Amino acid sequence: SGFRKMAFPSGKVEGCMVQVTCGTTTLNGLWLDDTVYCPRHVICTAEDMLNPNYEDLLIRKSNHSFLVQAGNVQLRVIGHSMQNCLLRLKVDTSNPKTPKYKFVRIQPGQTFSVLACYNGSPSGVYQCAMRPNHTIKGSFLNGSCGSVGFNIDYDCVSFCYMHHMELPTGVHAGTDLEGKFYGPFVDRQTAQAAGTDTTITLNVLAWLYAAVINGDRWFLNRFTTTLNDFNLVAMKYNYEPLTQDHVDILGPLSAQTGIAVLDMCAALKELLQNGMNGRTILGSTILEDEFTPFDVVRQCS
């Protein structure tokens, strides 16, 4: 890989992962201060999932109904409440490893790292992106629900995602840390379907600049284009339309590479209309769209 996908260091998040069990259901929870957040569907049985009435299912539960374990230590839940699609469990012990943090809701196309955990313990860290249709691509196993997505800004952890479910197609859906689902999805095991996905044009452009940054500009041409002409081509190949805001965002990359934004768009346009013809870019044979302009600048500086 001429350009590797990079995850944020996970240390600050590792110390926040716990296990929450309710009956036959066991999943991951996030312990910050004296509160443990986890998908509310932990209170559901396989049957409840077909059509759950959470407010009603929760009434039948009590503090002693939740078993929270941080490592080898069981924590005592002294309260439980529902926050949108998340279960907020109040515990009697404050997490001594709680880092400086924020809850942030990301936009489609933005990236983040996921600390995949199983039964309360960290397994690995993956870097991914929020698809335009609000789903996440990858592979999560039984018990991976509850794992979180995040970004780090110096010393502050910005949590932006918590995994909840796998859609019949195998794609993943989840919420922000306020328990609000990304997309039109709900935590019910129904026929739910994600909208047709598209390619993140802004990220593909950022990646093309990255490829140039690392000496590999065979794709660059002498043409240029405009937002109207490019978006026509974009509509054809199922690529997200480009906006002025996107062009402004690519400025820093434009300035440092000597390639005007619309000129890179002219290069992308040709690649879509002709193809790569065996030729490769950054050891890749397909146009990568999981690197944001911010990721490229961060990984290059």
Add this chain to the structure above:
Amino acid sequence: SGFRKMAFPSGKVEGCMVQVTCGTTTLNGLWLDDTVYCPRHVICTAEDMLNPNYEDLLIRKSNHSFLVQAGNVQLRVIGHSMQNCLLRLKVDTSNPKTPKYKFVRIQPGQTFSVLACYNGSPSGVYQCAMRPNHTIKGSFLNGSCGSVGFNIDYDCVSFCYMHHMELPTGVHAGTDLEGKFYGPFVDRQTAQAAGTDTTITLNVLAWLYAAVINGDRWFLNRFTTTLNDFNLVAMKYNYEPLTQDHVDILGPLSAQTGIAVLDMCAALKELLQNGMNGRTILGSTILEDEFTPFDVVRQCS
């Protein structure tokens, strides 16, 4: 990505990263107990690098010649010695975050995670593999030298690599934590060239099993083969030859997928002799060789 590359959680390694400076040269160091390990070339100037005499360059140095900084705290070096291509700096303070650990030398084709750091602070975590020609693929910036590669085994960190230099071709070379270079390389800025690289057959097979594990076996056929017939094809396409040990290693994957090892080899053989014809495997258009059979089993269980 139908199957994402996964790095180990980096928390245990993060608390071990420090900065070591000697003149205009600043790079990363690993602080374990009361010892800081770093590339010995930190004592070299751009000119010394053309043809360094380390034993002689080191004699001219003293403890006060090394500036070690862990975060915001300067550590006091009370001794310095050379261990092959590593500089061993004895410090007056033992690292309170030292994890349980081991130093291990990996074999070509094996994988590990790298905690890329710059000027002593963690930047990101990447998953990679030791190429058959003993180099590492990726992109390291000025000051990234000293970053380490590792694997985690439950609660023990097995350090297996420390980055030292970028070869003229842009590939990377380094040592194990005993300071022994992987490959024929030495820490001198000369014309050094890496042997022609090949594809890690064992890993490609592991990945093909992974693809099958996740429902995607269009490539499977009704043929079989043998180590002699496959290796003939392997020799043609610059693929590492398969050994009996490799076949034995793939057993667990074979048993759980219902595909005999030699049968998967028969499928790989056809893919090399014909190609993928636009068809893809795990959202990939080229045969991935950076997942070991152990990584696949670990990521699937």
